[PDB]
């Protein structure tokens, strides 16, 4: 008799994005038990009796365990829900543990080799099994439990008809003696899916609606798959569920008495607008950077008031392509420098956004207000550790002079942060992976003094507005002053040189607008004159 | 049998100022239990099984939870009051957790998909659901409880007849794995109301008095709503209670044996003088403002001894108008400077007072004597954090050089 139910199909279990992991598990675990026996006896090997699964929350471990349990033709599996073995008396936890293996031992002793398979599932295994000798209190029972489990899994007596599956979120807290080969060999990591996995998952959860003609014809799955970045399976299911409810709510009246139409309920359909609305107000991923960050960093957009704006972007694209393609230089760096109120952070954010890399992050000092020095170092190390895990990554470090506390008097600064940054600017990631680093500052000479400007590969200058023509172009692009008033403005600026930053012009205009209609251009010109110049 | 009670009515709940939040909760939680069952079957979706509510004190979380409990035709809800499940014997705190899900599992096994609804309420959830240490040697004091709860809400065995509601004041300490879209999917914030909500709350709490002609005719509720700026739900109720107590106290005499005059107690009525007295002495808000501080900082008033006094105030008016009527610049700052004893801290106080913004706070070094730099930074962060929960805020920083601990010798200061 085979160990697989005759009516089993891989597409029946409804799992998507884990083809490789399932293939590896099947190869390592069930290969021996399906192959003809005589060759196995000649070959003389022992079966494998251990599987461990780990990963971040909401990726599909329990689903794999349940589906594997359903696949095999054997006895009903035994499941342990967390720390359900602990007892108040003495020696009862060990008895509870021993009571799990009774049937397997009995069958092994009776029928010998020709025996069935027994499956045992441990959920949240890190609750009961931890490294021995680490608990200050109540450790008398925990160590005994661990020792009993170790002895039972692999002891003087030998069993050959048991399989053990474990799931955990903290793989590094488990006892090492439990992870050696012969006890728990197949160790698997379940991570976030890629675009193809997201597309497969999205297709899985929309089959019934399509089959029953409840899905509108204007919904494109590929657009959703492209848009939904950094999502996990649970989040995709939640998005679909919210979209379904937004449609059901249009046929209910909860004003005074809850009433349903029941005459328009028929012909219920789900449209693209429901998906869009559910994606902006209901579900939000818990990983990486998203739109709410770019909205804050780039508040007033980008306007082409001159030539240098295109020059900076065309210079950043060359570096993005170089990091993407080349293989002799896996690590690249660049420094954007310019005078104050020039708009460096916005340009850096725009370049990072158009990079289109899978992983993007922004490290800014405004998220670490009041922190000490070690806290700053540790918070930077964490952001740099998560880019090593990915394949190709981009990182942004803005306002360096504020990251390390610099003040002209003294001078005074944090040496620890400086040393950490100098170390991290020349550290390469593991083989086959690539990283881009962008940094912004407003004081080049200070960085030169500390010998940091030679740890960067290249620099890009961000200039200010220098001529009246550019000022008039910016005013026209903003559309704040009419042609009649712009004529008067041009009558004054064309015969002079200007020196102003973009971020200051938007404040000057707002200050001017408060005056009465007659005294607006006059106030604006007075403020501009007061600003002066110092190229 | 319908899930909703036959006689339920929204106006009967008695909650005002939260019409959008309740609509969202209803849509996301109860939409799929009211629609016809066959169509829901065809779609093949599962029900939601979690709600979380967070916000500052006194804004109506426990009232909403209780009303939601009373609006459903189901069993009697189970209630847990804080850390009521902790025990000293090994392995009992988790048996207590597992004992809350027995009935639901039994009914699911027996009746299948025709079961009722079982509700569970966790008051002060942050007391027993903190983040797990996840690093060897600082294992949390209670992690077995967290693991048991996680395993029971969503485990290898599937339930479809439960609903869990939680409440907290510090939403940033909860374990992340507990808040994923499969366990506690709907998260809501309950914040301070606006003028319309204040009017609605006052009407709710005055309806009964108005029924029996116990309220005088010179009381206007719109004026009261206008006056009470940045009041939480509880403070309005306290104000009404204080007014009623003041009204009642006039017909009692307690300096000797206690006697009640039951001949003029039948002509009892509540006047606006009681409300005015209550607004001045009894109730003091927390996110609002009070006139005592201005009297503390403008001790001797402001006299117009020349022209500059007018220019300084006109510039402040202009800046206030700009900050209130602007969209491209949501943040503006200004600095007042001059020689010593010139009176610059009173002018700033006067400008802030005349701004007429709902939220006005003053940060002064008088309250930070002997503090280390870390405590001073923490206090400043607290004030600025409180200032971000209002639609219009004004903040004043006074004596910057005494805040930095500057001394000409050296010089020395706090970086």
């Amino acid at each position: 008799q085979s160990i697989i139910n005759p009516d089993w199909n891989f597409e029946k279990m409804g799992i998507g994005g884990l083809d490789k992991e399932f293939s590896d598990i099947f190869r390592r675990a069930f290969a021996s038990r399906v192959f003809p026996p005589e060759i196995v006896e000649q070959m003389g090997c022992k079966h494998v009796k251990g599987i461990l699964l780990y990963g971040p929350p909401g990726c599909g471990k329990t689903l794999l365990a349940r589906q594997i349990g359903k696949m095999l033709n054997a006895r009903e599996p035994k499941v342990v829900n967390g720390p359900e073995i602990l007892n108040k008396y003495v020696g009862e936890s060990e008895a509870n543990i021993r009571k799990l293996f009774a049937d397997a031992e009995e069958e092994q002793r009776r029928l010998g080799a020709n025996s069935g398979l027994h499956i045992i599932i441990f959920d949240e295994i890190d609750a009961i099994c931890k490294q021995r000798g680490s608990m200050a209190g109540s450790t008398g029972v925990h160590d005994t439990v661990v020792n009993q489990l170790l002895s039972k899994i692999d002891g003087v007596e030998q069993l050959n008809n048991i399989l053990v599956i474990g799931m955990t979120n903290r793989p590094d807290l488990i006892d090492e003696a439990l992870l050696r080969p012969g006890r728990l060999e197949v160790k698997m990591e379940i991570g976030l899916p890629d675009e193809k996995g997201r597309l497969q998952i999205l297709h899985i959860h929309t089959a019934r609606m399509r089959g029953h003609q409840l899905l509108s014809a204007d919904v494109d799955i590929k657009e959703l798959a492209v848009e939904t970045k950094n999502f996990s399976g649970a989040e995709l299911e939640g998005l679909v569920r919210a979209a379904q409810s937004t449609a059901m709510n249009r046929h209910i009246k909860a004003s005074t008495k809850v009433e349903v139409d029941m005459e328009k309920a028929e012909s219920l359909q789900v449209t693209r607008g429901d998906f869009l609305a559910s994606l902006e107000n209901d579900i939000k991923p818990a990983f990486g950077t998203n739109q709410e960050d770019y909205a804050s960093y780039i508040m007033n957009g980008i306007i082409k008031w001159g030539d240098p704006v295109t020059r900076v972007l065309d210079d950043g694209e060359l570096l993005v392509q170089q990091t993407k393609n080349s293989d002799r230089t896996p690590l690249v760096s660049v420094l954007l420098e310019g005078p104050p109120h020039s708009g460096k952070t916005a340009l850096a954010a725009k370049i990072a956004e158009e990079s289109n890399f899978p992983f993007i992050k922004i490290c800014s000092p405004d998220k670490m207000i009041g922190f000490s020095e070690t806290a700053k170092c540790q918070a930077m190390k964490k952001i740099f550790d998560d880019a090593y895990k990915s394949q190709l990554s981009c990182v942004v470090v803005d306002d360096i002079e504020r990251l390390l506390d610099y003040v002209p008097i003294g001078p005074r600064f944090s040496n620890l942060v400086l040393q950490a940054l100098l170390v991290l600017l020349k550290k390469a990631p593991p083989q086959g992976r690539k990283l881009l680093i962008i940094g912004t500052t407003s004081r080049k000479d200070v960085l030169q003094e500390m010998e940091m400007l030679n740890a960067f590969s290249t620099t890009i200058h961000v200039p200010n507005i220098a001529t009246g023509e550019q000022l008039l172009e910016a005013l026209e692009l903003l559309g704040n002053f009419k042609d009649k008033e712009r004529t008067t403005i041009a009558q004054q600026v064309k015969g002079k040189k200007v020196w102003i930053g973009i971020k200051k012009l938007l404040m000057l205009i707002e200050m001017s607008l408060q005056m009465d209609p007659e005294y607006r251009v006059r106030k604006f010109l007075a403020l501009l004159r007061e600003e002066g110049a110092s190229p | 049998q319908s899930i909703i009670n036959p006689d339920w009515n929204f106006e009967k709940m008695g909650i005002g100022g939260l019409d959008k939040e309740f609509s969202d909760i209803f849509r996301r939680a109860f939409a799929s239990r009211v629609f016809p069952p066959e169509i829901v079957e065809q779609m093949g979706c599962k029900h939601v099984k979690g709600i979380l509510l967070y916000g500052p004190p006194g804004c109506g979380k426990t009232l909403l939870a209780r009303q939601i409990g009373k609006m459903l035709n189901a069993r009697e809800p189970k209630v847990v009051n804080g850390p009521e499940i902790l025990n000293k014997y090994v392995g009992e705190s988790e048996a207590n957790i597992r004992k809350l899900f027995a009935d639901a599992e039994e009914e699911q096994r027996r009746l299948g998909a025709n079961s009722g609804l079982h509700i569970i309420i966790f008051d002060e959830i942050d007391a027993i659901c903190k983040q797990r240490g996840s690093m060897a040697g600082s294992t949390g004091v209670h992690d077995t409880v967290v693991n048991q709860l996680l395993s029971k809400i969503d485990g290898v065995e599937q339930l479809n007849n439960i609903l869990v509601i939680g409440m907290t004041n510090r939403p940033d300490l909860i374990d992340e794995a507990l808040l994923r879209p499969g366990r506690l999917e709907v998260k809501m914030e309950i914040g301070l109301p606006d003028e319309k909500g204040r009017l609605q709350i006052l009407h709710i709490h005055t309806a009964r008095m108005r029924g029996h002609q116990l309220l005088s005719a010179d009381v206007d509720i719109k004026e009261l709503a206008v006056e009470t700026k940045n009041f939480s739900g509880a403070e309005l109720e306290g104000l009404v209670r204080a007014a009623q107590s003041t009204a009642m106290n006039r017909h009692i005499k307690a300096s000797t044996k206690v006697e009640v005059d039951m001949e003029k107690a039948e002509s009892l009525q509540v006047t606006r003088g009681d409300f005015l007295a209550s607004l001045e002495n009894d109730i003091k808000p927390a996110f609002g403002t009070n006139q005592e501080d201005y009297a503390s900082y403008i001790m001797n008033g402001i006299i117009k001894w020349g022209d500059p006094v007018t220019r300084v105030l006109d510039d402040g008016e202009l800046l206030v108008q700009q900050t209130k009527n602007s969209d491209r610049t949501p943040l503006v700052s200004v600095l007042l400077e001059g020689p010593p004893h010139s009176g610059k801290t009173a002018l700033a106080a006067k400008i802030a007072e005349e701004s007429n913004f709902p939220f006005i706070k003053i940060c002064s070094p008088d309250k930070m004597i002997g503090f280390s730099e870390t405590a001073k930074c923490q206090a400043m962060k607290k004030i600025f954090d409180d200032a971000y929960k209002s639609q219009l805020s004004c903040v004043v920083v006074d004596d910057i050089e005494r805040l930095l601990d500057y001394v000409p010798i050296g010089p020395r200061f706090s970086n």
Binding site: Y89, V90, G137, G140 | K88, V90
Partner: peptide, 16 residues
């Protein structure tokens, strides 16, 4: 000095 935290307890059963 921070006072020592709380502790669990273990129990022993007797037969009459």
């Amino acid at each position: 000095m921070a006072e020592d935290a709380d502790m669990r307890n273990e129990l022993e059963e007797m037969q009459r």
